[PDB]
Amino acid sequence: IDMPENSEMKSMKNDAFSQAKFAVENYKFENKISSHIKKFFDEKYGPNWHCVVGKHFNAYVSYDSKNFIFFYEGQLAILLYRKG
Amino acid sequence: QYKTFMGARVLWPPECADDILEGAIRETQDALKKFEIAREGQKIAEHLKKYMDDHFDPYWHVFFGKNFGCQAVHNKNRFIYFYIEKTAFLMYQTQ
Amino acid sequence: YIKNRFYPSKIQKIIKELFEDRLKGVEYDPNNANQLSERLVLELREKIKRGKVPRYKIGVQVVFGEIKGQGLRIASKCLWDVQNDNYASYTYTSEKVYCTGIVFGCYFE
Amino acid sequence: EYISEEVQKAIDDSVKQVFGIKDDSSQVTITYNKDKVNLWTQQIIDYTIRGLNKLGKHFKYCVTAILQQTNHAGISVQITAYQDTNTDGSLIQCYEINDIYAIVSVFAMAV
Amino acid sequence: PLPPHIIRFNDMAQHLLKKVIRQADVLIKENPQGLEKDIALNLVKFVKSQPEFKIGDGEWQCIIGKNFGCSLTFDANVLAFFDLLPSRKSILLFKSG
Amino acid sequence: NHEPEVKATDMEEDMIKRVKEIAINAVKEYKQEKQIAHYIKYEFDKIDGYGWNCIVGRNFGSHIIHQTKKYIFFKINELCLLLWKA
Amino acid sequence: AESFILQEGCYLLLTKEIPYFDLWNCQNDYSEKIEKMKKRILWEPLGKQISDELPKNRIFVQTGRKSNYGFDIPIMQASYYMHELGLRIETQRLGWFILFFKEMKEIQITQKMNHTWLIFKVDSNITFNSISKDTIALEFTGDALEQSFFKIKNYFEENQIKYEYQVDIPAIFQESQIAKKQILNNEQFFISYIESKQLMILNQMKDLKLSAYKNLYEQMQISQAITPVENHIGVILVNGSYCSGKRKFAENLIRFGSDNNLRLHLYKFDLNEMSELTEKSYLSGLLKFASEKKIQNTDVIVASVPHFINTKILIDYFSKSEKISNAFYIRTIATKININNIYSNFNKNPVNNVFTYGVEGYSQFLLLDTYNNYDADVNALNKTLSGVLPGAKIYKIMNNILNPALAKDILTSITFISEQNNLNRLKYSVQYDLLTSNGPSSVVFIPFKLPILREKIRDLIYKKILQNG
Amino acid sequence: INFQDTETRYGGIQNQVVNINQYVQRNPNFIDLDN
Numbered sequence A: 001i002d003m004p005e006n007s008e009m010k011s012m013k014n015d016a017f018s019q020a021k022f023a024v025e026n027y028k029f030e031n032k033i034s035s036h037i038k039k040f041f042d043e044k045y046g047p048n049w050h051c052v053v054g055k056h057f058n059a060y061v062s063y064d065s066k067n068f069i070f071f072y073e074g075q076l077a078i079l080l081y082r083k084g
Numbered sequence B: 001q002y003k004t005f006m007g008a009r010v011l012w013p014p015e016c017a018d019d020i021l022e023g024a025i026r027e028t029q030d031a032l033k034k035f036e037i038a039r040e041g042q043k044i045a046e047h048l049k050k051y052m053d054d055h056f057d058p059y060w061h062v063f064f065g066k067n068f069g070c071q072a073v074h075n076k077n078r079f080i081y082f083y084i085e086k087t088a089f090l091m092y093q094t095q
Numbered sequence C: 001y002i003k004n005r006f007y008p009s010k011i012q013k014i015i016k017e018l019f020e021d022r023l024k025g026v027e028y029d030p031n032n033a034n035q036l037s038e039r040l041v042l043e044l045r046e047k048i049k050r051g052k053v054p055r056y057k058i059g060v061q062v063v064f065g066e067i068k069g070q071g072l073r074i075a076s077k078c079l080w081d082v083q084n085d086n087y088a089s090y091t092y093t094s095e096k097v098y099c100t101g102i103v104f105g106c107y108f109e
Numbered sequence D: 001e002y003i004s005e006e007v008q009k010a011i012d013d014s015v016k017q018v019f020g021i022k023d024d025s026s027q028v029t030i031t032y033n034k035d036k037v038n039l040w041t042q043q044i045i046d047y048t049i050r051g052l053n054k055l056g057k058h059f060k061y062c063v064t065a066i067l068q069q070t071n072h073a074g075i076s077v078q079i080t081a082y083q084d085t086n087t088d089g090s091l092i093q094c095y096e097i098n099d100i101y102a103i104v105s106v107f108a109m110a111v
Numbered sequence E: 001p002l003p004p005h006i007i008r009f010n011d012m013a014q015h016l017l018k019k020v021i022r023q024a025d026v027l028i029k030e031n032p033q034g035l036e037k038d039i040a041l042n043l044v045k046f047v048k049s050q051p052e053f054k055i056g057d058g059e060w061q062c063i064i065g066k067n068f069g070c071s072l073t074f075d076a077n078v079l080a081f082f083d084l085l086p087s088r089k090s091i092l093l094f095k096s097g
Numbered sequence F: 001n002h003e004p005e006v007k008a009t010d011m012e013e014d015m016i017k018r019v020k021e022i023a024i025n026a027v028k029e030y031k032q033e034k035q036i037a038h039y040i041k042y043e044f045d046k047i048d049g050y051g052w053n054c055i056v057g058r059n060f061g062s063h064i065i066h067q068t069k070k071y072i073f074f075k076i077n078e079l080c081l082l083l084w085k086a
Numbered sequence G: 001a002e003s004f005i006l007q008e009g010c011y012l013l014l015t016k017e018i019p020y021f022d023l024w025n026c027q028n029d030y031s032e033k034i035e036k037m038k039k040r041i042l043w044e045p046l047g048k049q050i051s052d053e054l055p056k057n058r059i060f061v062q063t064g065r066k067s068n069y070g071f072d073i074p075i076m077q078a079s080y081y082m083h084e085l086g087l088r089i090e091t092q093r094l095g096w097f098i099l100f101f102k103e104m105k106e107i108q109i110t111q112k113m114n115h116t117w118l119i120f121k122v123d124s125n126i127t128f129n130s131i132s133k134d135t136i137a138l139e140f141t142g143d144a145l146e147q148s149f150f151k152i153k154n155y156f157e158e159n160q161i162k163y164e165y166q167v168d169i170p171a172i173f174q175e176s177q178i179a180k181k182q183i184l185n186n187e188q189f190f191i192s193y194i195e196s197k198q199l200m201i202l203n204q205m206k207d208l209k210l211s212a213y214k215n216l217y218e219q220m221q222i223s224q225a226i227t228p229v230e231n232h233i234g235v236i237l238v239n240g241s242y243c244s245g246k247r248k249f250a251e252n253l254i255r256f257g258s259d260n261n262l263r264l265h266l267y268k269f270d271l272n273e274m275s276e277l278t279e280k281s282y283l284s285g286l287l288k289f290a291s292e293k294k295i296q297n298t299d300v301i302v303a304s305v306p307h308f309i310n311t312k313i314l315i316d317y318f319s320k321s322e323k324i325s326n327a328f329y330i331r332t333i334a335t336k337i338n339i340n341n342i343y344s345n346f347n348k349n350p351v352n353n354v355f356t357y358g359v360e361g362y363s364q365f366l367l368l369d370t371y372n373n374y375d376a377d378v379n380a381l382n383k384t385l386s387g388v389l390p391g392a393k394i395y396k397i398m399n400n401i402l403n404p405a406l407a408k409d410i411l412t413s414i415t416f417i418s419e420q421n422n423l424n425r426l427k428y429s430v431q432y433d434l435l436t437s438n439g440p441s442s443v444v445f446i447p448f449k450l451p452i453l454r455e456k457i458r459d460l461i462y463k464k465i466l467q468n469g
Numbered sequence H: 001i002n003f004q005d006t007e008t009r010y011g012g013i014q015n016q017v018v019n020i021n022q023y024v025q026r027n028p029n030f031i032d033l034d035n
């Protein structure tokens, strides 16, 4: 229902979905999931990212423009954004 | 083992400075108590991060709720993680 | 069993206000330097007498000198259980002076 | 159940064995260096505490050290404790070779 | 009283630094938007002007940043590096050796 | 990982290549900013006398001078390396 | 038809980038039926889903052993059209084809690749059934991912047919050749070999048999190195034409005891022997020094060769003479060039052997000495030297001053013994030819004890120099 | 727990001013600064 945006052309927006859904099935604890998403996105694009996973949580963060992606993945919610 | 503190359950040995810790520990239940309730969401964490940026160093992130979990890099010795009455609170700084 | 505990920021403050108001940008006169240390060391000890730490044991130490295009290293190492015993320290330098005080703490038991 | 003179002997053993050389030529070949000072400080303290742990005494120690480059600046070193009359104590020592002015300050406390 | 600040590393006599602080603060207010080029340009062209600051081996350099690291063969007399607390800009001033 | 690339430069060809080689070696060897700058500075102080200056980072701007044929600013994998003489 | 080069061991096909096999489709009759698919009527096995266009998508048809030979079917560009149970693929090269979701035997998908892929197997392939090996990979890109790949995934769930994830790169992508050039995104070794054999033949037709074969390729993978000889003596020479300023540089070097060598033996000259030296007597001189000082094996020597002796016969004697090799070996060779002494005459002309002492094989390092020289001229010279000598380590000294890092780099670095330079120096025998004569007539010395007013020295330096032409 | 006691001591070091070869500042010095 909510989809905060990022850069154009689906360089990044397209990548995150495809990766997240390998991630959700392949593990059970959030630890390996968030670690896996962050560990991939550091190698591909940028030097320091931040990721959150869960069914329910409040949050409010500072970041770099057009690098904030938030999406409801299945029952879970996944949050991702660069910083640093 | 989540040792008890006069605020709430905090994982020890602490990975944050004592003054910063005490500030967080007292501000959370003060700010909850005075004119704030559990029904409201974002407008808490709003105030918490504002309070930290006013006095302490400028760049903070706050995450709290009833279920989540994260890995994250952060400035050295600037990690606050605590439960209070089955509610997880997490905060950290980045340059 | 340690209900009351030693925290670094308190002594950090305490030494902070002691040093500036007492030193007041003084110069390094040889005839009085050693004994300058003697007054303010005991003054310090008096302050930590009201530092609110019953069993923590207080091995004060001070350094006082003049900087003259001069390189210096001062460092220390500890032997204590982290859960209880802890330390604190402060430095303070003007254009030609430097005074630095370290305070130990060991919970008696 | 100790004697502080023996503590001083152990410290002297450490410092002399580590850098101190009987023939006085290499200690001029080893002057104060900006690069090497860190290794020297950490190595001195580590070897000294190794010597201190060779002692099986149940007492409880702590260490401090100072390295001054030249005599011109001058310095004051002072101790003041709050401890036991019977067993507790402290110790100091000053040390010199050619252009290195070293000091050690130790505290020994019971339990 | 000076505007508040943090001295990470200074080597010139304090008065030179005081002048630097006052001008830098008023300028940073004067140019609160744009690029840090302009801050460097204006700061140099002021600093290059005064009959003070007479002695120079090479000549003036001013660098601004929020994240970097550096190695510099500065002239042994003059070098400064500090930060302006409202904005937290790490500002570096020296003469080329 | 990727090769370097000059975003702004003033050098001769043979001298562009040497800084290429040394930047790759420096990043392969050390892992910290002041260490990188210190190493490159030493290498070009060995090869061309005294008076090199180098600033490495991710966020900075500059007003400087140099000798006319001795300035370069190039980027490697989102790292901005600036180098100049005098 | 084809055109190639064939040298000795291997050959090079000049034209390989043109694919051996390619085709196009010239029959529209069947494609027209698919092309025109009216909307309002539907046919069940396809479904009815609507997708405007899915451009920029790639199709790979796998080929087996024939691909390794160089015969392969190329990668097609294509777009897709989606329906509830089928997929209408538009290939630019081959037309409109139909994919039903029952044909797939096994399934894999990969997150490793830069774009998301979908591999599967089908019994009957679209192309010639004879050559193909009946596995098909379809890439998805851009909007296709959200629009198609994920809907197909839902279909797989509902049927419970097994879908697998492959972490590593698929084997078939590694098997082929066009696969290699599309996943990535030798000849210079060929060129180096040809020029190497040209130079070796230039040395001597009879003696140009160092490797002269596939053993040369074993030198390509000779990167890893190791060598160290104990109980011997490491010499660090210093070449340089006359009036290059080598003696005092060597003395500046010997003062470096700080490094981990710590003990090193000077070599000391004086001018009166210096007149009467010869290549042969040199060797005896070093042996005499070794006996005189009772030198241990660890320590090293700093000897400064005059200009008149020629290093070629010296290396000949190092390798040939028994005793010398029994107790001596060469660490490294340094050199010297002076900008002020570059030219022999006022008309541009070079003094003897300036740009032949720096050859890559024989002299490791090249140093410039400059005093009171404008910077621009020095830089121009830098370019000329780099041009004359293809590869050399050029530094810059100002009036014989040593950076301590340079001193460490010189003193501790032994690389001359390494076999790589041992073949390199043979590659460059023709260029490093030095001709010089030593004799009573070539160089002479005259003792003289008397005082001299300076004006007539100016008479000499003016008249003899201007009229020397 | 009443555990009063007190002590003192002093270190110090020899004094000597040479001032013959004195007062060098290596003029083209180098340092390494970061943020």
Ligand SMILES: Nc1nc2c(ncn2[C@@H]2O[C@H](COP(=O)(O)OP(=O)(O)OP(=O)(O)O)[C@@H](O)[C@H]2O)c(=O)[nH]1
Residues within 6 Å of the ligand: G241, G242, G243, G244, G245, G246, G247, G248, G338, G340, G369, G370, G371, G398, G399, G400
């Ligand atoms: N005074 C002066 N020195 C120079 C000049 N050009 C170069 N030099 C320096 O002086 C040295 C020149 O060497 P020479 O004057 O030929 O005498 P040398 O140093 O004994 O050289 P060798 O005869 O080979 O041993 C160089 O190494 C430079 O360091 C110049 O124009 N004037």
